[PDB]
Amino acid sequence: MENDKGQLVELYVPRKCSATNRIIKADDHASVQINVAKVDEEGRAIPGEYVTYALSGYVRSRGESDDSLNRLAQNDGLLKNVWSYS
Amino acid sequence: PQAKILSQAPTELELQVAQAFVELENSSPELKAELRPLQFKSIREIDVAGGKKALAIFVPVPSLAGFHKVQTKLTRELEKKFQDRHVIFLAERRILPKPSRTSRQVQKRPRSRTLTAVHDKILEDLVFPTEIVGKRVRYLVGGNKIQKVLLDSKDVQQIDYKLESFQAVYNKLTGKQIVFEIPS
Amino acid sequence: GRMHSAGKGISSSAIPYSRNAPAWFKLSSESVIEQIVKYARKGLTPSQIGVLLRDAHGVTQARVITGNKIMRILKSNGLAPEIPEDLYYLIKKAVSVRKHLERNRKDKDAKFRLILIESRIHRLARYYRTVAVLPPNWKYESATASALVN
Amino acid sequence: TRSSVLADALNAINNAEKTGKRQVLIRPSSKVIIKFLQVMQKHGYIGEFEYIDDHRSGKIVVQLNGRLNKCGVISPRFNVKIGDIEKWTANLLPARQFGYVILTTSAGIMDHEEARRKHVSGKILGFVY
Amino acid sequence: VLVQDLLHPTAASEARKHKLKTLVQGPRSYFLDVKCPGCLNITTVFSHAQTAVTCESCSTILCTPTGGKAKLSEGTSFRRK
RNA sequence: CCAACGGGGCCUUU
Helix, strand or coil: CECCCCCECCCCCCCECCCCCCECCCCCCCCEEEEEEEECCCCCEEEEEEEEEEECHHHHHCCCHHHHHHHHHHHCCCCCCCCCCC | CHHHHECCCCCHHHHHHHHHHHHHHHHCCCHHHHCCCCCECEEEEEECHHHCEEEEEEEEHHHHHHHCCCHHHHHHHHHHHCCCCEEEEEEECCCCCCCCCCCCCCCCCCHHHCHHHHHHHHHHHHCCCCCEEEEEEEECCCCCEEEEEEECCCCHHHCCCCHHHHHHHHHHHHCCCEEEECCC | CCCCCCCCCCCCCCCCCCCCCCCCCCCCHHHHHHHHHHHHHCCCCHHHHHHHHHHHCCCCCHHHHCCCCHHHHHHCCCCCCCCCHHHHHHHHHHHHHHHHHHHCCCCHHHHHHHHHHHHHHHHHHHHHHHCCCCCCCCCCCCCCHHHHHC | CCCCHHHHHHHHHHHHHHHCCCEEEECCCCHHHHHHHHHHHHCCCCCCEEEECCCCCCEEEEECCCCCCCEEECCCCCEECHHHHHHHHHHHCCECCECEEEEEECCEEEEHHHHHHHCCCEEEEEEEC | CCCCCCCCCCHHHHHCCCCCCCCCCCCCCCEEEEECCCCCCCEEEECCCCCCCECCCCCCECEECCCCCCEECCCCEEEEC
16 A cells, blocks of 8 residues: 555545444445534534544444444543443 | 571571560460471561562471461561561472473472462462452553452451552562452 | 253352362361261262261361362272272162063163163273273173172 | 364354454463464454453453454364465465464464564464454 | 443342353352250251251251252251351 | 664573
């Protein structure tokens, strides 16, 4: 993906699922990307500031999507006590 | 007296502790009976964090079962006389090398003399009053190991403050990291 | 699975993690060794002796309280039987089935079960010859087996 | 009738990885399993792992990070001469420039590239990529 | 489901599993101190006893075997040891 | 100089 002179020779570098590290192919039309608004200290949403997650079609089809997103959001500040490790 | 309570009396620190045995044996008519047959072989001082030191006392293994009847009190007493010390008793055990394919034959190596077996017994002696209830070994991505030893939550107050000294002692004797944990 | 059927059960004992005597137990090792020898003179097998000590006394496991297993303790005192007890019980069963068949030659089912018992004898006896607790050329045979147990 | 404790362990890891789990437990352990996992860990295919004592051959819990495509065992353990190593890598690995074949040699357990530097051979165990 | 702690199971979920399938094996039987109504002599009884344990002082019987736990007799008193 | 990869000797109950 680099040639001998050190030049990049990929077309593009794919996105990877934040739940499972799988590559998201160019035709996985079931995959989605979620944007969560950042919140100002006066309690109002700031325009154009996001926390972002990506999920593969495999996870969504299997019904794990909601549980995975609770875990990710809770190790960021977005949730308090929804998810439990045990 | 002193050279007759040591199995050898080569050096002065053992003479100090030997004297303490003779002293304590008089202070109570009870100890006059129990302590009389006991002897110890060597002492080593190991420095630990916080400036303290561990008085590691080495005992002949066939007599070890006797000290367990008197190891309480003795620790109470000796940590008064030698202020700012932690005292622990260990049995001396042989360890025999593993036979090579080239070596000439010898009598079959008893399993109790293997290196793995001896290190396990050392750890059992350190925490003497408490039982060990489980073990874990962690293999970190950096390529090194740590053991965790889980202790029975019974009478732990007798050792509860010593744990850091045990970690330092065990490392000196073996080179291995351990940590102690107490399940509720 | 079972050696001679489709059964798949998993029931068994589960011995404790701790390898040293429980804190509430307080007899001496010599005391319990005397008990073991006492029952052996009375004619009990190692299996039976272990049961009595478990539930009539505090003895959780003899190997933990003493240093040794019950079978070795008896052998060290000259009380060892001429053949191992599990092989003994197999031969005893075979004799009683063979007796039943003397009266009931139509009992095709019993005839089938006898063949299975005798296969277990051969597989076990072959083991004991290899570790030399039985003499070589010891052999089970239908006629003499009755006197061997009796 | 477990004929190979190593074969069971790598089979459990594959099935967990395919479904997307982050951890797996394997029973029993052995010295050979530990050595095999340490090689996989060195090259970054797995996280840390932890051994549980039980007086009965123990258990292992492994953390999984999503990088592993496949691992597997070769049975029987064929004898391999130094000239043969090039054939096994052509058959088993997906490309000339990543993945590993794993050998037991009297110099220890190691991947096929280390064996070339040290110039040793022995018997094949398995592969990772 | 996909992420869970296998090394620190909760005490409640551990208590309901079969004795061979917990993280480490162990028994769930126990021992009793038992006294007959007459004598002072205590004796120790295994909770799944198979024999009909007598008192030591006399041939009064303390328990009888069943398919599971032993049935203690009437009038006895006991303490879990 | 310095980094990697290979190798020998000695001590640690050996």
